[PDB]
Ligand binder design. Structure first.
Ligand SMILES: Cc1cccc(CC(=O)Nc2cncc3ccccc23)c1
Ligand SMILES: Cc1cccc(CC(=O)Nc2cncc3ccccc23)c1
Ligand SMILES: [Cl-]
Lengths: 305, 305
């Protein structure tokens, strides 16, 4: 029993965290095999960040301008290249602690663990979700650039995020490990406002199923809804549209609890309408949306309570 | 910016997790140097749990009855002993991944990271606090016994918890690494329950300071209170008594924000008597009490390990 916001064990990632320095700028890098992946803005000054020409800033650099530090051992850069907004620094030594890894681009709603790092040194590990507006509600201070997001299913580390910046609203923007930004964001100091955020409906539903598995049934009702009628109500509370793909993805949880997806949809409709009335669902007074259907099956028991 | 429930990087602990098997029972063990620490109930059957004489059950065991597995390598047990409710299995090989460590007994209100494991394999990591009633609100399934709680103090892993059982309310009970249970619990299948829990007042205040640091000031007011008047209000709302030691521990946060401790108490008193009035503090509709003053300073300053 119990339901916690659970992050993957960070050990496989900690062993990849290095410090990258280009002049006055110091951030984090991910050392996998003989390559160090880091944000390309490491080559910029604060003046450069307004309208940077990365190709022009990078052409003025040599391998020895990049200082890479893996703990108290300096790595020697033998090559450099840029792939979108990520700087790939070829080093003279392959990371002996390189785990089995893949680079995955995740979709909004998908969750991951973040190993927050400062000066190539892991500070903490937390869970978060890729918001529908493509930002993440992270916990990051200056020097956290290059900290990564990942999932570890079946002993393999799937890198999905590299932190690049903090937007004016306190939320964070970053890229996949191939340098492609999530969302309409750029690595420039310009008017980039996070678009209006919405609640991840499939996740809230998954968490309601987690609550049923853990014994909470107070929010359930005798009603059902059509998928279309649920959407018309949900969009009014700034909830993401629930699609047929989400209904299918919730199938196993629906079969485990005996509560059909559109019956759990009626519960969410009522919950949005009435609020909690002084009650909590899995220790929360809010409808939690940073647990995916996959996370619920991962964490929760196979036997319903 | 951002404030997440953050656990310590689990890597130093992951390298110590092994699988312990005694007959039909399989749980987790902590392998530090040449000793594997695990719950002593590993030697018991389900009929034994009703009334176990651990010394008598253990005297009937030999070293080879204990199967220890560190990944896909079997460790050979060369000795065994008991220290309170922990089984210390002397093994032939010392853990090469043994980090700098101490065994610390924590007090209620203190938080720690839990590396949940199944079959000696780390599954996830989360942050939790030792409740004033000495239970932990963990997330554990069958097979999680032997999972550990820890904090990192610079380079030193301070082991503070080993998981032993789940109480009828879904909350968890365990011991320090010397086998001494936290709370009035015994390691036996008998009627046991969690005493009425209280809210960790110093931790709620610390999280209000975190909210102020992160830009939330709606709950602040022009008022102050005496420590004694605040304690009358705290006793009414099932909050732990706030002491002069807690007031001193909150000093740095008080100086950083400019909000005196008794000034933040007057904000807490207003939230307890009136509620939040439809608002949230750091994305929560409840007053969060699982962040210590040190956790707030560590996450808002970026300490590394
Ligand atoms: C691409 C880009 C453009 C301009 C400036 C930057 C630096 C940046 O955003 N750094 C930070 C990253 N995360 C959290 C931060 C919190 C406080 C201060 C700085 C933070 C990056
Ligand atoms: C000392 C003791 C007495 C009686 C029973 C036990 C076993 C026990 O409670 N194990 C578990 C621990 N955490 C989560 C569990 C979830 C489901 C089932 C079992 C779980 C221990
Ligand atoms: Cl006994």
């Amino acid at each position: 029993s119990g339901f916690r916001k659970m992050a993957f064990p960070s050990g496989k990632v900690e062993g990849c965290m290095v410090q990258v320095t280009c002049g006055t700028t110091t951030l984090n890098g991910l050392w996998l095999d003989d390559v160090v992946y880091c944000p390309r803005h490491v080559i910029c000054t604060s003046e450069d960040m307004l309208n940077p020409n990365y190709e022009d800033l990078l052409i003025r650099k040599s391998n020895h301008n990049f200082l890479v530090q893996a703990g108290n051992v300096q790595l020697r850069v033998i090559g450099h290249s840029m792939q979108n907004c990520v700087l790939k620094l070829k080093v003279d030594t392959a990371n002996p602690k390189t785990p089995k890894y893949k680079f995955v681009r995740i979709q909004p709603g998908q969750t991951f663990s973040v190993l927050a790092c400062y000066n190539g040194s892991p500070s903490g590990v937390y869970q978060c979700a890729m918001r529908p507006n493509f930002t993440i509600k992270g916990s990051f201070l200056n020097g956290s650039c290059g900290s990564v997001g990942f999932n570890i299913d079946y002993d393999c580390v799937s890198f999905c995020y590299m932190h690049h910046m903090e937007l004016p609203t306190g939320v964070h923007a970053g890229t996949d490990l191939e340098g492609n930004f999530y969302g309409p964001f750029v690595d420039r100091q310009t008017a980039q406002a996070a678009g209006t955020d919405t609640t991840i409906t499939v996740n809230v539903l998954a968490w309601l199923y987690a609550a049923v598995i853990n014994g909470d049934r107070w929010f359930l009702n005798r009603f059902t809804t059509t998928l279309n009628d649920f959407n018309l109500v949900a969009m009014k509370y700034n909830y993401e549209p629930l699609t047929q793909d989400h209904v299918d993805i919730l199938g196993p949880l629906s079969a485990q609890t005996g509560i059909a997806v559109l019956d759990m949809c009626a519960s969410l409709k009522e919950l949005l309408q009435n609020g909690m009335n002084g009650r909590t669902i899995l220790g929360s007074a809010l409808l939690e949306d940073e647990f995916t259907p996959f996370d619920v099956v991962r964490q929760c028991s196979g036997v319903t309570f």
